[PDB]
From a paper:
To this end, we synthesized a 15-amino-acid-peptide (250–264; GQSGSSGSGSNGDNN, designated as Derm15 hereafter) derived from Derm and then characterized its binding to ClfB using the SPR (Surface Plasmon Resonance) assay. In the assay, ClfB bound to the peptide with a dissociation constant of 2.37 µM. Interestingly, the results also showed that the Derm peptide interacted with ClfB with slow kinetics, further supporting the DLL model. To understand the molecular mechanism underlying this interaction, we solved the crystal structure of ClfB(208–542) bound to the peptide at 2.5 Å resolution. As expected, Derm15 interacts with ClfB in a nearly identical manner with Fg α(316–328) and CK10(499–512). The ClfBArg529 forms a hydrogen bond with ClfBAsn328 and the C-terminus of N3 forms an extra strand, which is similar as that in the ClfB-Fg α(316–328) and ClfB-CK10(499–512) complexes. While the wild type ClfB bound tightly to Derm15, the mutant proteins ClfB(197–542) S236A or W522A exhibited much lower binding affinities with the peptide in mM range. Interestingly, besides the low binding affinities, both mutant proteins exhibited rapid association and dissociation behaviors in the experiments, as compared to the slow association and scarcely any dissociation behaviors observed for the wild type protein. These results indicated that the residues ClfBS236, W522 are not only involved in the binding with ClfB, but also participate in stabilizing or “locking” the peptide in place. Further supporting this prediction, our structural studies revealed that the binding mode of the Dermokine-derived peptide to ClfB is nearly identical with that of the Fg α/CK10-derived peptide.
Numbering used by the authors:
A (entry chain A): 210 to 540
B (entry chain Q): 315, 318 to 327
Amino acid sequence: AKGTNVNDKVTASDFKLEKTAFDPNQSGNTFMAANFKVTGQVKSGDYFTAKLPDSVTGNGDVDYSNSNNTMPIADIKSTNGDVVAKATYDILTKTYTFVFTDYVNDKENINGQFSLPLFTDRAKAPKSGTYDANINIADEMFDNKITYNYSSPIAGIDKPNGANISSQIIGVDTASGQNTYKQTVFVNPKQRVLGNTWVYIKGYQDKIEESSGKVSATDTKLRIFEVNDTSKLSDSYYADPNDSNLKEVTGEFKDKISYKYDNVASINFGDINKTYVVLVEGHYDNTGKNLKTQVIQENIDPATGKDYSIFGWNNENVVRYGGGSADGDSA
Amino acid sequence: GGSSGSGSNGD
Ligand SMILES: [Mg+2]
Ligand SMILES: [Mg+2]
């Protein structure tokens, strides 16, 4: 029974970010860690909170939309095993709520510590740069400066007509059992002149038997957006379908998409000129093995006819973990 | 041995 907010009775101490700068596009993240003391006593149901700013998240590329935007967090326990608090995280409000167990009833003067992984907010920190990241714990603000150095999505063969494609898995549902994923593909970020262009989306890289991903007309939904100003796309791979910079052309690709070949989707872009965003809504099996994907783009020269080029891009994500402990007095 | 992400599962 979630009851009373006792932020006024808890105080945080020794706050440090594990590191202040990283690359979210190369599995970069960090941790917030701190001690806390409960001046006074509490009981089963009392709770305290931590709150994340716009710049960061607490779930990262793991999606919890099909799970009521609530992600469970590892129990906070004593030395001798018993749970001292149950912890939860709200994605939408970026709120950590630690609610005490009955363990704390017959206890007094509770001290503890936690370590929680922090990731980027691809939507709200869409560009590489230095952001403000002031974390709140127990009605107390801790100022930090965070710095995201994204590996640019603008990548490809180094000829004026060379294939160039990038992608990123920015959402993965591991909790629901629905097993879904959201991936953003950047087709032609160099926006160079390309001829007879083809794009392939695989959910397996080199070995099918090694990536859980599944691509077919059933498990995969695709949306395609003509970009107006490539100068305004995110470095974080986040893409807003309702951005005016994007124009959905999905209705123009009816007879240009194929799921015939195993675990791959073909997209006949043809003679293109601009950058295109492809929103991918896919699924992965219950084989328990990892989700590994690959996007491949190939093209000729519009002016020549020869001058072939092909380019591949691998994706995979890593899981981090939270940790916490606490204790009081056995009387 | 390219782009990769990171996230949390809580459990
Ligand atoms: Mg306080
Ligand atoms: Mg297939």
